[PDB]
Design a binder for this molecule. Sequence first.
Ligand SMILES: CN(C)c1ccc(C(=O)NCCCCCCC(=O)NO)cc1
Ligand SMILES: [Co+2]
Ligand SMILES: [K+]
Ligand SMILES: [K+]
Length: 357
Amino acid sequence: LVPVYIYSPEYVSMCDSLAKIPKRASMVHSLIEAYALHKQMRIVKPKVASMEEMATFHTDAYLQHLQKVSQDSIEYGLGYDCPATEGIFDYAAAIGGATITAAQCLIDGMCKVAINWSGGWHHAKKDEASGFCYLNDAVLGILRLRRKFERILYVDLDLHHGDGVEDAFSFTSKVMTVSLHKFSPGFFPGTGDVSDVGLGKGRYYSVNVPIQDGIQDEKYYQICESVLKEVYQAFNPKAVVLQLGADTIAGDPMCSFNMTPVGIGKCLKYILQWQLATLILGGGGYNLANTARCWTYLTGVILGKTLSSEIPDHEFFTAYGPDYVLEITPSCRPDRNEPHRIQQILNYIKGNLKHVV
Ligand SMILES: CN(C)c1ccc(C(=O)NCCCCCCC(=O)NO)cc1
Ligand SMILES: [Co+2]
Ligand SMILES: [K+]
Ligand SMILES: [K+]
């Protein structure tokens, strides 16, 4: 009954070493902990991913290059996007096996909810590092759930289209990928439009909710709930893998959406309320301070608690200036989202979302 928390001082400090999000893992942990939230969670040391466990989704031709590069890489996407910095491999198996580990504690009755905030890398392709993802811990996790479950539902709430995971299963009807993400021309990865729904026996079992800048907790919880509404029926999932990137939270430098940990919390509540096994992953999130606030607050809903509004003093207490409160206030900017356009989509989806069984 006690949610699993994938921790380990080794792990956390292993993640801290990721260039793009320095010490993010720590700030997240320390804050979640300085809230005594781990006192109500089944902490579990995460295992390192085996070369054969990663070989479950990634080609060996690729897994190979990753290993012999963490001492013509430009062929695996190892450039400015995903630099081949020494050790990124030892790091990959870390986050990967860390998600697989949480997958297990889910199919072991060990809990109805496993959490691993350091995971979420969804852009990673079968044989190609993409958008800061060198391994696709999400796919690796979904593939571990496929052992005890027959229909896994992946829900990507990160600001970017969860493509890597989507393609990983676009040809299957056993895993349905839903993704709410800003869609616009020139904005990464650029894929994932409402039209996009997969192929093969997996046609339609791929959902996409292209949103514009500004969307706040209101219009968001509606779109998310309604879209999940249809999906909980048409698909009737067994397990759930939810990606919760916090780069959709007013504050992030990505400066696109304009949510707060609350809107995303409603969605989380609505999904938790199906009581199916749920694997929680984090992902993007560029306002280190804010990111920790958002996930801690989310850890707080998963635990059903109501966290203190004032930010407890902890190692990084300094970085929550200049208000030192757990809440985020929406930016004072517009909502380029047409109420009418949202409708066309919500329907086009409702439409496609039916030919399912
Ligand atoms: C200010 N600065 C130095 C930069 C700003 C933006 C990017 C970028 O978006 N690059 C393209 C790849 C973006 C990947 C985002 C990964 C993500 O959040 N996935 O969910 C790079 C550098
Ligand atoms: Co993102
Ligand atoms: K997304
Ligand atoms: K699919």
